[PDB]
């Protein structure tokens, strides 16, 4: 009747595989577990579910361990991909037998996956203008710390950085400003032991 | 190969805390808990108790919740359990339990311990 | 709590003769599982669901019945001076196993 | 996707459930927030046409309507802040005997927003697009176009990119959705190579609160 | 005019109010039928949002709903015979102090019609003009054109005259709606001096299940 | 908090006045009787309110007759129109004081109004087809009684002539048909003293 | 001009039925209802019944309910009560009343007969 | 059922002196009608409505007063032995009259 996951997040590279746990108190007899994912976009994906009577039930990458005695349920993904960066929600679902049993849900863990390739590439920087709207593209890094910044005297807005994962598996980070000049503007981009500017690369 | 060993028969006093103990080799402590169950020629035998290593948590026998205590150890995969009041016809054989791997053979007890016998005064 | 009982308590059988050994139950149980028992040894494994066999038993053991009084059979005997000793199930919170049928060769 | 609905405080709200059942028996809503775990609200019979809500819950707050022969739509009488949250259509499904009813069907839920006396403020994405750099030195000039999605209030917005045909979704590698003083943030980027440059690009945008109530498609003009 | 709501049994429907109230406090719900008189069903109160309801009715089956700010809903959530009628939104009018709330505000009334299972026949007006005799005899051929609506299964029809001007309504003396074995058939008529002979004239239908759901507008062409 | 109207329909001539009856059982101290019409297209117009306490109300041609002992309100409509063909609802209004009150109606009461003018006028006929359906018209006629019926060896349908009243104050009957011959097909109606057919006007 | 006529006064015994009459000239007798209200030197004026010709209907004060019954004639339009057990110190004036045509002095009782007094053993 | 009580149960009036007699009631009436007797007569029609005047009564006659304690004034007595004598409501179903009050010209 009462279900937690410890655990607030947990991340992991694209090789290797991580578990999630679930504790739950219950005074039903017999009893089914659901697992389920939330994408962000919001989505509930029903991905496996245990019977409290059967054995361990495997489904493709996701494997669980139950412990009957215990009370413990864990969830196993082995060689997770790039999508598995959603939620996961471990329901201590009621005797099914009925069609109006409700799921418990617990607070569910965030699980976020780091990209499995490790080369060194440099950074290549450009800037690109709207009106006094500037944004400058650092494109094809791999070292997460580059602190991008851009050069101007006068300074209207500034928002954080935003940086996600290419398709080739490495960083691309995007910044943007409301700077008042538009052709003095020069962004610059600290390497993870250099630094370029955008005098170059034109 | 799976297999639990367990510590000789003791003899004991009317009064006293006895400790029985059980160590696991041949696969990860962590993953897989431990049964305890009592045998006796009048009673049969019957489950008095379980623990997971992994977290500690424990499940007694509503009979026996309170007479037995249980600990695990899984620097050296050993579980102990605690008995009291010994006296009260308490002489019987006490066996480990560990599900088979995955739990292929459902709640079956696959592997067993060779018994240790408990006879009091 | 499902006190598991066991209708033979003791049996006479013989080689080239089959028999049954039933569980009854007082409360449904859904899945039912037996362990076989021999003189200075712990009990072994045996059966893991009803009409299976697990850890390597001869053929002639099976299992039979309904969700309530679950049978076992055995087809011939040979040299063993017990079958199937115990029951168990887990359906409800306190796993019971049974008195426990012996049977001696004869 | 997603939808929204952003209905002010002390007035009704009409969630829709995206299920296509044809034989359900009864429909199960669940609500879920940030930081809590998602918990039922009522669930609504099919055969007879009661509802039974849990404990805890006010009567007549929660009512069930169907439009259609199969469309359930949830209707919130009163609203007050913490009302807010994800609504989930759930439903349980087939495969009694066996695999026993081995999933609970959930809806894409549709996220409430509970404000006071609206924003007013004519809060729609207001679009700002770049114009792709000189950058015939690397990846000879394939440029990045950029949809800036500037003011908007509603948290959810889908963003995706399509060329002259729509046949194929375009990978288009998002941004973030900061939060300025009264309203929300989101741009999005998208590198194209030289042999498809000639194409003009749509970036689509999905919102509630968009002029004229449909996706917006605003347009990046080809260059060879 | 008078809209209707033809759901079958077993199945939800809902009834708008035609009242143009800005600061209404309690909103009346009256069923009149055939051979009885009218009888207030519940009442819905505009600052709390609970609605009351009248003894001798069955809880949960009447529902009060605000998509706007001022626009209420009556939904009746399943429906059987004897439920049939015309229902209509009231409100007290203003002059508490003076002329002691002379009013009770009524509206339009909307028919709701049950039956079962639908007719599935294609119930919609199908019209079959005439053409004026050869009259030159008496009123110099003024002619009477006649618009025969044939086979629709809900009562209620409006049909009026019109030229290829709709500024002002043509005078058009009705017939009478008799009913066929399974559906109901009107029609009208006009008779139109030959100093306007030379319009053509518009004979507009409005009525629930109608094709493409706007109100029918058959023409009948102009003769010199 | 019971209202009775015992009449089930009244018909009078244009310029002569009708009286409508309501006899009602209250046990409220003061109230409101309320009058409605409603239009054959379903609507329901206020027309009058008498107080219980007051005196009597006349509002344009519409007047109240209030007896408090005897508790029996008249509504009296003095040279009424050709619109005046509705039915008349006698509400005993709750005290209006709050804004909860419903109204108490009864059964009403309808009203038909025939024509004043009384000339004599000779039926005009004309016979219009379309396809296989026919209609027959008879038009500026005073006499009620016609009759008007149609020749034609194979009947198919049949439909109920529908009589109406001409703006000009004399009545307009039509008649249709589905016969299976349209040539053949004649009209004929009968005067109050005379007969005429389609031979004729043609 | 609007007139109500009544009986002279009558002498009566102590257990009778006795009939009062009242006649109404000047106006439609149909339309408008009669008041029936009783006058004496102690207990005052107080209203005692009422009757419409049109329909029959009568209202009675609750204490005076029983003891007197009204009947109407349109075709004599004249009015008739009907008093009981008249010894019980019923010795008083009776009046008609009629409001005014139209009801413009609201409640107000604008014509009146001349009273018929009642006077037991 | 109101009592329609009269405080003054007699007035010694004279000839240029304006009085005021009060009729109160128990219970809240909304509108409040008078009448006059004299000896040997039926009483008169008189007052209609409060604050009101019918019948052809002289102007000196006047109503006042909230929907409880109506009251009604003259302003001048002449010759008249009795200038109004009773009341009478109708805003309950029992309509009662009153004790009625008598002023003897002096
Ligand atoms: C900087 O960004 C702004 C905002 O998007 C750009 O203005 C937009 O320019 C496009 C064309 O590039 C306009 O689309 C077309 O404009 C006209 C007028 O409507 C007409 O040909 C078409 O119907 C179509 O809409 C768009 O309207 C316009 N937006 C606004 C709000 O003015 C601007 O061009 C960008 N600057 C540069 C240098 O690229
Ligand atoms: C959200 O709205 C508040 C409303 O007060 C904004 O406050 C703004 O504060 C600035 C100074 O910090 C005021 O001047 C502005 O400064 C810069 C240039 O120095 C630039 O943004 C503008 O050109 C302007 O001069 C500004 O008037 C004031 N806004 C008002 C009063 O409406 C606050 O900055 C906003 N927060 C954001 C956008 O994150
Ligand atoms: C007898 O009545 C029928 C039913 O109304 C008449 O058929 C209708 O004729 C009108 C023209 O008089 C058609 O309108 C026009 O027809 C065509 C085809 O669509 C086109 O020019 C216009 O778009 C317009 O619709 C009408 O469609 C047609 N209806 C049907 C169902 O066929 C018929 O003409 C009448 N016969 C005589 C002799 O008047
Ligand atoms: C309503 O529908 C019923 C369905 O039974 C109609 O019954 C119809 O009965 C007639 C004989 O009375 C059958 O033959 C028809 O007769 C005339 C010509 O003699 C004509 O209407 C048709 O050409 C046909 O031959 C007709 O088949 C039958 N209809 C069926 C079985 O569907 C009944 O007349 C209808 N009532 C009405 C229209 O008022």
């Known amino acids: 009747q009462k279900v937690t996951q410890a655990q607030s997040s947990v991340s992991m590279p694209v090789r290797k595989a991580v578990t999630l746990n679930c504790?739950?108190?219950?005074?039903?007899?017999?009893?089914?577990?659901?697992?389920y994912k939330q994408l962000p976009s919001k989505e509930m994906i029903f991905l496996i579910r245990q019977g409290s009577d059967e054995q361990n039930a495997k489904s493709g990458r996701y494997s669980v361990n139950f412990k009957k005695a215990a009370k413990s349920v864990a969830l196993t993904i082995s060689a997770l991909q790039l999508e598995d960066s959603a939620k996961?929600?471990?329901?201590?679902?009621?005797?099914?037998?009925?069609?109006?049993?409700?799921?418990?849900?617990?607070?569910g863990t965030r699980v976020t996956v780091e990209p499995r390739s490790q080369p060194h590439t440099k950074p290549s920087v450009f800037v690109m203008k709207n009106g006094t709207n500037v944004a400058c593209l650092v494109k094809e890094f791999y070292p997460k710390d580059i602190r991008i910044n851009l050069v101007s005297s006068k300074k209207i807005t500034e928002f954080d950085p935003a940086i996600v994962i290419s398709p080739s598996g490495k960083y691309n980070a995007v910044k943007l400003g409301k700077y008042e000049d538009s052709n003095s503007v020069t962004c610059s981009v600290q390497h993870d032991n250099k630094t370029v500017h955008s005098t170059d690369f034109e | 190969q799976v297999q639990l060993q367990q510590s000789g028969a003791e003899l004991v006093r009317p009064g006293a805390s006895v400790t029985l103990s059980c160590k696991a080799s041949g696969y990860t402590f962590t993953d897989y808990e431990v049964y305890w169950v009592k045998q006796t020629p009048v009673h049969g035998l019957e489950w008095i108790g379980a623990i997971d290593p992994e977290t500690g948590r424990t499940a007694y026998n509503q009979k026996f919740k309170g007479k037995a205590i249980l600990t695990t150890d899984k620097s050296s995969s050993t579980a102990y359990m605690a008995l009291r009041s010994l006296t009260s016809e308490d002489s019987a054989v006490y066996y480990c339990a560990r599900l088979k791997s995955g739990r292929y053979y459902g709640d079956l007890f696959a592997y067993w311990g060779q018994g240790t016998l408990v006879t009091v005064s | 709590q499902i006190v598991l009982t066991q209708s033979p308590a003791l049996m006479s059988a013989s080689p080239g003769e089959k028999v049954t050994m039933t569980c009854s139950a007082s409360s449904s149980v859904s899945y039912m599982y037996w362990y076989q028992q021999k003189p200075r040894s712990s009990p072994k494994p045996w059966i893991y669901f009803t009409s299976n066999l697990a850890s390597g038993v001869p053929a002639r053991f099976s299992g039979s019945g309904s969700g309530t009084s679950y049978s076992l059979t055995i087809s011939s005997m040979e040299a063993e001076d017990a079958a199937t000793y115990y029951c168990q199930q887990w359906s409800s919170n306190p796993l019971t196993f049974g008195a426990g049928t012996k049977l001696e060769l004869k | 996707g997603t939808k929204s609905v952003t209905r002010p405080t002390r007035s009704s709200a009409e969630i829709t459930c995206?299920?296509?059942?044809?034989?359900?028996?009864?429909?199960?809503?669940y609500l879920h927030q940030e930081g809590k775990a998602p918990q039922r609200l009522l669930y609504y019979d099919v055969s007879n046409s009661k509802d039974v809500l849990e404990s805890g819950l006010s009567p007549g707050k929660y009512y069930t309507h169907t439009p259609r022969r199969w469309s359930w739509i949830l209707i919130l009488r009163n609203l007050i802040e913490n009302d807010s949250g994800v609504?989930?259509?759930?439903?349980?499904?087939?495969?009694?005997?066996?695999?026993?009813?081995?999933?609970?069907?959930?809806?894409?839920g549709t996220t409430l927003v509970v404000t006071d006396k609206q924003l007013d403020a004519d809060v729609s994405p207001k679009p700002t697009i770049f114009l792709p750099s000189i950058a015939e030195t690397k990846l000879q000039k394939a440029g990045t176009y950029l949809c800036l999605l500037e003011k908007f209030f509603p948290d959810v917005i889908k963003i995706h990119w399509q060329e002259k045909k729509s046949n194929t979704i375009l990978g288009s590698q998002e941004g973030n959705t900061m939060k300025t003083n009264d309203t929300y943030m989101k741009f999005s980027w998208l590198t194209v190579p030289e042999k498809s440059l000639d194409k003009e690009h749509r970036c689509i945008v999905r919102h509630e609160n968009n002029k004229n109530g449909v996706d917006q498609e605003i347009i990046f003009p080809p260059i060879k | 005019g008078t809209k209707s709501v033809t759901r079958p049994t077993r199945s939800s429907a809902e009834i708008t109010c035609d009242l143009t109230?800005?600061?209404?406090?309690?909103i009346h719900w009256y069923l009149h039928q055939e051979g009885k008189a009218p009888q207030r069903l519940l009442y819905y109160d505009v600052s709390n949002s609970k609605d009351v309801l009248e003894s001798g009715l069955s809880p949960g089956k009447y529902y009060t709903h605000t998509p706007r700010r001022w626009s209420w809903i009556l939904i009746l959530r399943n429906l059987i015979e004897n439920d049939s009628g015309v229902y209509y939104c009231?409100?007290?009018?203003?002059?508490?102090?003076?002329?002691?709330?002379?009013?009770?505000?009524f509206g339009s009334g909307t028919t709701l019609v049950v039956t079962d299972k639908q007719l599935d026949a294609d119930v919609s007006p199908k019209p079959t003009i005439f053409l004026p005799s050869i009259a030159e005899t008496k009123l110099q051929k003024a002619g009477t054109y006649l618009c025969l609506l044939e086979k629709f299964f809900p009562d209620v029809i409006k049909i009026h005259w019109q030229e290829k001007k709709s500024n002002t309504i043509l005078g058009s003396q009705e017939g009478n709606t008799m009913k066929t074995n399974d559906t109901y058939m009107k029609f009208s008529w006009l008779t139109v001096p030959e100093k306007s002979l030379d319009k053509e004239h518009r004979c507009i239908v409005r009525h629930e299940n109608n094709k493409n759901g706007v109100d029918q507008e058959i023409i009948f062409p102009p003769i010199k | 908090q019971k209202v009775t109207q015992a009449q089930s329909s009244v018909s009078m001539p244009v310029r002569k006045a009708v009286t409508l009856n309501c006899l009602y059982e209250?046990?409220?101290?003061?109230?409101?009787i309320f009058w409605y019409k409603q239009l054959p297209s379903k609507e329901m117009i206020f027309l009058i309110r008498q107080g219980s306490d007051e005196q009597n109300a006349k509002s344009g041609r519409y007047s109240v007759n209030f007896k408090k002992a005897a508790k029996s309100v008249a509504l009296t409509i003095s040279a009424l129109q050709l619109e005046d063909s509705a039915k008349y609802f006698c509400?005993?209004?709750?005290?209006?004081?709050?804004?909860?009150?419903?109204?108490?109606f009864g059964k009403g009461t309808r009203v038909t109004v025939e024509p004043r003018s009384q000339p004599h006028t000779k039926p005009s006929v004309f016979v219009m087809k379309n396809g296989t359906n026919v209609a027959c018209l008879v038009k500026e006629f005073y006499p009620k009684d016609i009759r008007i019926n149609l020749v034609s060896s194979k009947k198919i349908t049949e439909f109920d002539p529908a009589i109406v009243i001409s703006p000009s104050g004399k009545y307009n009957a039509v008649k249709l048909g589905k016969y299976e011959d349209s040539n053949s097909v004649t009209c004929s109606v009968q005067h109050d003293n005379k007969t005429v057919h389609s031979t004729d006007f043609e | 001009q609007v007139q109500l006529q009544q009986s002279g006064a009558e002498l009566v015994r102590p257990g009778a039925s006795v009939t009062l009459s009242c006649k109404a000239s000047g106006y439609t007798f149909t339309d408008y209802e009669v008041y029936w209200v009783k006058q004496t030197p102690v207990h005052g004026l107080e209203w005692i019944g009422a009757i419409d010709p049109e329909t029959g209907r009568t209202a009675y004060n609750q204490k005076f309910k029983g003891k007197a019954i009204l009947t109407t004639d349109k075709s004599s339009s004249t009015a008739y009560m009907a008093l009981r057990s008249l010894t019980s110190e019923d010795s008083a004036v009776y009046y008609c009343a009629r409001l005014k045509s139209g009801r413009y002095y609201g409640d107000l009782f604008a014509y009146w007969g001349q009273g018929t007094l009642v006077t037991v053993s | 059922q109101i009592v329609l009580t009269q405080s003054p149960a007699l007035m010694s009036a004279s000839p240029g002196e304006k009085v005021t007699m009060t009729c109160s009631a128990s219970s809240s009436v909304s509108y409040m009608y008078w009448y006059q007797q004299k000896p040997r007569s039926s009483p008169k029609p008189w007052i209609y409505f409060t604050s009101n005047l019918a019948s052809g009564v002289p102007a000196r006659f006047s109503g006042s007063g909230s929907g409880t304690s109506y009251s009604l004034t003259i302003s001048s007595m002449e010759a008249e032995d009795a200038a109004t004598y009773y009341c009478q409501q109708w805003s309950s179903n029992p309509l009662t009259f009153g004790a009625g009050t008598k002023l003897e010209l002096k």
């Open positions: 509400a005993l209004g709750d005290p209006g004081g709050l804004n909860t009150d419903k109204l108490i």
């Open positions: 209250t046990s409220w101290w003061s109230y409101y």
């Open positions: 009231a409100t007290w009018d203003r002059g508490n102090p003076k002329t002691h709330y002379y009013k009770k505000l």
């Open positions: 109230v800005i600061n209404a406090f309690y």
